[PDB]
Design an enzyme around this catalytic site. Structure first.
Site, PDB file in Angstrom:
ATOM      1  N   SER A  35       0.810  -1.230   0.000  1.00 32.91           N
ATOM      2  CA  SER A  35       0.000   0.000   0.000  1.00 32.91           C
ATOM      3  C   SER A  35       0.858   1.303   0.000  1.00 32.91           C
ATOM      4  O   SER A  35       1.735   1.491  -0.860  1.00 32.91           O
ATOM      5  CB  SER A  35      -0.973  -0.044   1.186  1.00 32.91           C
ATOM      6  OG  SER A  35      -2.156   0.718   0.940  1.00 32.91           O
ATOM      7  N   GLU A  43      -8.993  -6.064  -4.744  1.00 36.51           N
ATOM      8  CA  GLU A  43      -8.392  -5.037  -3.873  1.00 36.51           C
ATOM      9  C   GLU A  43      -9.448  -4.156  -3.254  1.00 36.51           C
ATOM     10  O   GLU A  43      -9.330  -3.758  -2.104  1.00 36.51           O
ATOM     11  CB  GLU A  43      -7.434  -4.128  -4.642  1.00 36.51           C
ATOM     12  CG  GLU A  43      -6.128  -4.745  -5.109  1.00 36.51           C
ATOM     13  CD  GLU A  43      -4.993  -4.590  -4.125  1.00 36.51           C
ATOM     14  OE1 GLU A  43      -5.171  -4.083  -2.991  1.00 36.51           O
ATOM     15  OE2 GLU A  43      -3.898  -4.978  -4.488  1.00 36.51           O
ATOM     16  N   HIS A  95      -7.462  -6.054  -0.101  1.00 35.27           N
ATOM     17  CA  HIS A  95      -6.266  -5.338   0.063  1.00 35.27           C
ATOM     18  C   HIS A  95      -5.676  -5.965   1.303  1.00 35.27           C
ATOM     19  O   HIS A  95      -6.369  -6.121   2.285  1.00 35.27           O
ATOM     20  CB  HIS A  95      -6.540  -3.846   0.191  1.00 35.27           C
ATOM     21  CG  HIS A  95      -5.304  -3.013   0.198  1.00 35.27           C
ATOM     22  ND1 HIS A  95      -4.572  -2.771  -0.941  1.00 35.27           N
ATOM     23  CD2 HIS A  95      -4.665  -2.365   1.211  1.00 35.27           C
ATOM     24  CE1 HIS A  95      -3.529  -2.015  -0.631  1.00 35.27           C
ATOM     25  NE2 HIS A  95      -3.569  -1.751   0.657  1.00 35.27           N
TER      26      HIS A  95
END
Length: 536
Positions: A187, A320, A438
């Protein structure tokens, strides 16, 4: 038999027993920066002063201040710029390749602790793992435009720069090979890596990189200055007097717990329609220091990136966007909001309002041709958010590598869909949902607080070993081919096409495969919104 000399003093680690059975040397809490304390709050990091007495690093350190959402508690310590070494053993004569990890957390939270980033799985292969704390939120990314004030911005990115400089200057004595460093990030941590790749301030400090679900091409990776230094001082309870300069010294005077409490709290514009993810994030710096990370626009920095000369591996997961449903469980019917579509057409396109109207219609037809968004009929919005927030940036990064880099670029896609082992989707999003979300994939790389481990007949175990093998395979010889890819009869090749899409290793429940990206059609659509704008 477990004391090491670092350039700033002596350091003693521990020995321990993995979640698998193997033993490993661990060092935690090694200072590489003087506590950004008091005067040095908000500022670029400086080395620690030498210490003569052997310091204990047998236990984890406190994180840089933030709201730890797993605890729902502010937490931390300002003197937290410490670094962490895990390895099977110390061979200063057989220097091992280094994997260097940078955590994610939207630049607002995050920690290098072994309770999310457990080294148990990775310490089986012959590398040296490194992880470290860098400052987040306002404490790490406040930006005062007066040179008088000494807060250019990006202090967290400079914390990461120093850390890398430290692995170079020290890791030799932990069995590390300072010229075989792979930088790895997830990220914000991935966006961080890519800033290190495109900034001259981080030039040739490492040799390979793995970029995970994060990019300088995601709009959320860069903040605009909109009077943030004062809006925060105000929200914290500041007289209004002194300008920005004067709001700073009030902030240097504030309890950091207050800074954290008020950070994200009273901040965003609502003109975050113009994507402001966060306001204490990376920024284009108002003037130049020697430590400067972001001298000009990232978009332009990228075109001449030193990083284009080294090999990288990049990818993300198949759903995601699951991250984005969080906000949706809290006040649903924002999916019935009628600007739901039109507000995901990227804000800064030089397109007319009629085109923008027209683009958002193509988005409806793509993600919701006939059915209506809702907490139960969400896949379309999860796809939307996956593309807008993550993959379109990953894809642009891949296109830009194909055009301007003569290096190797490896692309992966994680699809691992497990009923119990996808921790982040299950604990932080919803125990109801399916898909790969994610940071799901981080369960398959790092051990965490669950002490959890699939039991070798499960496909989850196949997943664990596959990732651990490809990522360490790459960390070791810049080649992600390994045992697990072999025993499926596939070759992970570096990417060599953009049309009709790029090719990736798809790591699914049922094993691996080297294929065209399967969701290319969606991203063609995002590319097309960029018709009067340069993609890279």
């Amino acid at each position: 038999s477990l004391t090491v000399q670092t350039k700033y003093g002596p350091v003693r680690g521990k020995r321990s027993v993995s979640l698998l059975g193997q033993e490993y040397v661990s060092f935690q809490g090694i200072p590489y920066a003087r506590a950004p304390e008091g005067e040095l709050r908000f500022k670029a990091p400086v080395p620690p002063q030498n210490w003569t007495e052997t310091l204990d690093c047998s236990q984890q350190c406190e994180p840089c201040y933030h709201f730890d959402r797993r605890l729902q508690k502010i937490v931390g310590c300002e003197d937290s710029l410490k670094i962490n070494v895990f390895a099977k053993e110390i061979n200063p004569s057989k220097p091992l390749p280094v994997m260097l990890y940078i955590y994610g957390g939207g630049f607002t939270e995050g920690t290098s602790g072994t309770e999310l980033y457990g080294p148990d799985f990775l310490v089986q292969k012959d590398i040296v793992l490194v992880s470290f704390n860098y400052r987040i939120g306002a404490l790490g990314f406040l930006c005062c435009q007066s040179e008088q004030d000494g807060v250019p911005g990006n202090a967290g990115l400079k914390d990461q720069n120093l850390a890398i400089r430290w692995v170079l200057e020290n890791i030799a004595a932990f069995g590390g090979d300072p010229k075989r460093v792979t930088l790895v990030g997830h990220s914000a941590g991935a966006a961080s890596v890519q800033y290190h790749l495109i900034s001259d301030a981080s030039k040739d400090l490492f040799q390979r990189a793995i970029v995970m679900s994060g990019s300088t091409y995601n709009s959320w990776s860069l903040t605009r200055q909109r009077n943030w230094v004062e809006k925060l001082a105000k929200a914290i309870g500041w007289d209004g007097q002194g300008g920005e300069s004067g709001a700073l010294r009030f902030l240097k005077a504030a309890k950091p717990e207050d800074i954290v409490a008020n950070q994200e709290k009273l901040l965003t514009d609502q003109d975050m329609q113009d994507d402001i993810f966060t306001p204490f994030g990376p920024t284009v710096e108002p003037y130049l220091t020697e430590q400067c990370m972001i001298p000009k626009e990232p978009f332009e920095m990228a075109r001449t990136a030193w990083g284009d000369k080294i090999d990288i591996m990049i990818g993300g997961t198949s759903e995601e966007g699951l991250l984005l449903l969080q906000k949706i469980k809290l006040q649903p019917e924002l999916l019935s909001h009628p600007h739901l579509f039109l507000g995901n057409v990227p804000p800064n396109l030089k397109i007319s309002m009629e085109k923008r109207i027209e683009f958002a219609a193509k988005l409806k037809q793509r993600y919701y041709p006939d059915s209506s968004p809702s907490m139960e009929n969400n896949l379309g919005y999860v796809h939307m958010m996956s593309d807008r927030v993550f993959w379109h940036g990953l894809h642009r990064t891949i296109l830009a590598r194909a055009a301007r880099s003569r290096a190797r670029t490896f692309v992966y896609r994680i699809c691992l869909d497990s009923e119990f082992y996808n921790h982040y989707r299950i604990m932080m999003i919803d125990p109801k949902l399916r898909g790969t979300a994610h940071a799901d994939e981080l369960s398959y790389l790092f051990s965490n607080f669950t002490q959890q481990v699939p039991g070798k007949e499960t496909f989850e175990y196949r997943g664990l070993q596959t990732l651990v093998d490809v990522f360490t395979a790459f960390v070791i010889n810049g080649d992600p081919n390994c045992g697990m890819t072999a025993k499926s009869g596939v070759v992970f090749e570096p990417n060599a096409q953009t049309k009709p899409t790029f090719k990736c290793l798809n790591i699914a429940n049922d094993g691996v495969a080297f294929v065209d990206y399967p969701d290319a059609d969606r991203l063609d659509m995002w590319d097309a919104m960029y018709v009067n704008d340069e993609l890279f």
